[PDB]
Amino acid sequence: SSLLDIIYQLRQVPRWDGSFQFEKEDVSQHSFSVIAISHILCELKETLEGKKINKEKLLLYALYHDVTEVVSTHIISPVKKNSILKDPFNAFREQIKNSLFDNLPITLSDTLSTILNNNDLEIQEIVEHADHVDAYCKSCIEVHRGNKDFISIQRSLGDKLDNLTKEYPYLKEFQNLFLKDFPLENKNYRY
Amino acid sequence: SSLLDIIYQLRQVPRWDGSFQFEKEDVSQHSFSVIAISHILCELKETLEGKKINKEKLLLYALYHDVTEVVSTHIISPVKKNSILKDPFNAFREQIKNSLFDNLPITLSDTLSTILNNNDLEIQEIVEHADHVDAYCKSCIEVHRGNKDFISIQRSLGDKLDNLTKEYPYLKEFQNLFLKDFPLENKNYRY
Numbered sequence A, B: 001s002s003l004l005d006i007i008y009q010l011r012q013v014p015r016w017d018g019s020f021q022f023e024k025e026d027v028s029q030h031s032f033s034v035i036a037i038s039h040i041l042c043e044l045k046e047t048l049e050g051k052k053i054n055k056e057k058l059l060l061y062a063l064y065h066d067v068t069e070v071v072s073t074h075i076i077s078p079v080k081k082n083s084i085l086k087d088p089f090n091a092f093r094e095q096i097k098n099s100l101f102d103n104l105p106i107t108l109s110d111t112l113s114t115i116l117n118n119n120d121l122e123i124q125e126i127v128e129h130a131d132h133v134d135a136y137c138k139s140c141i142e143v144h145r146g147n148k149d150f151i152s153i154q155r156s157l158g159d160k161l162d163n164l165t166k167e168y169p170y171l172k173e174f175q176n177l178f179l180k181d182f183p184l185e186n187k188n189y190r191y
């Protein structure tokens, strides 16, 4: 099986191609953050919208969200979302999904196929929102480090986030809890 | 709240201090791998030992397993497990846990306290096993890159893993599925 190799190979898939970064980010670092953000968003949404989400399925979907990038590499969203490329790349992503875990024990292979092909629209939406939050957070950290090339990126992502918070109360709450002062300049909790 | 800052600050906590690495590893990369390994181990154990584990609680425990290292830094196990330091460092880790999420909404703060203070012995044990698997995997990748300084590390971790597989059938199955050929020299799944 290639499953464990793929989990570690995600460290070789860089994000933010075409942008200068003070800290290079790989898909594994990004995915760790997205799992944590997805969890927090889920807890806020459950309390706000009076429900219980299947957190096992959500966390697993966040965990493997970007696993197909071990084949596709990470195509930055200004490229991937071009009208010329949007639908072709989604078709490519589907071809990758269908071939990835080709050599597993069937109880395990079905569980992985279940995650990658999850048709739960709400779980898909939470992780998409988490992905946007994480990209915004990275842009905040780069600007904090002094990276002026990320100012316009932070502005674009922050504008979209602001528009999202008008339609999704759990995102507005997340923004109020964590994104108005991010990153923390003084790491008081270390001491 | 410091929660989101801490999630990203884990990228500044290096592992393997005192060892030459071809690839520097941080706690966020390691934690991503441990979440995935914990999931796989859980699925194997459920099928082998005829049970169902609360995977939400397991995945959350793996996700925040090392969060106190944002305060303690990552103390390598040959140091942390010295008889002089073993119990003091565990007491330190407990003091950190008690102070970490000091400024959260109570529904969220209780959920985080619930994770960090989880007294589920089986979940604790799965993640401890996942931690050992991940450390072994890292040592395999370093040796694969040509890092002779990791040969003795790989030998030590592999010896302990082998002894563990004699007592835990789900670990023996994991080893048979993934660890006999790791990492993959030819990344066929990319093509």
Ligand SMILES: Nc1ncnc2c1ncn2[C@@H]1O[C@H](COP(=O)(O)O)[C@H]1CO
Pocket: A015, A016, A017, A019, A074, A075, A076, A077, A078, A131, A132, A135, A152, A153, A156, A157
């Ligand atoms: N304004 C921007 N300029 C350049 N790259 C950007 C960007 N906004 C996002 N990215 C990159 O696209 C990735 C996000 O895509 P996903 O949500 O699919 O992970 C980001 C990191 O490469």
Ligand SMILES: Nc1ncnc2c1ncn2[C@@H]1O[C@H](COP(=O)(O)O)[C@H]1CO
Pocket: B015, B016, B017, B019, B074, B075, B076, B077, B078, B131, B132, B135, B152, B153, B156, B157
């Ligand atoms: N033989 C060895 N020589 C040096 N560092 C080692 C080691 N074995 C493990 N480490 C490091 O200790 C960490 C593992 O500890 P945890 O399980 O608590 O994460 C490893 C990476 O720093």
Ligand SMILES: [Mg+2]
Pocket: A030, A031, A034, A065, A066, A131
């Ligand atoms: Mg993502």
Ligand SMILES: [Mg+2]
Pocket: B030, B031, B034, B065, B066, B131
């Ligand atoms: Mg760990």
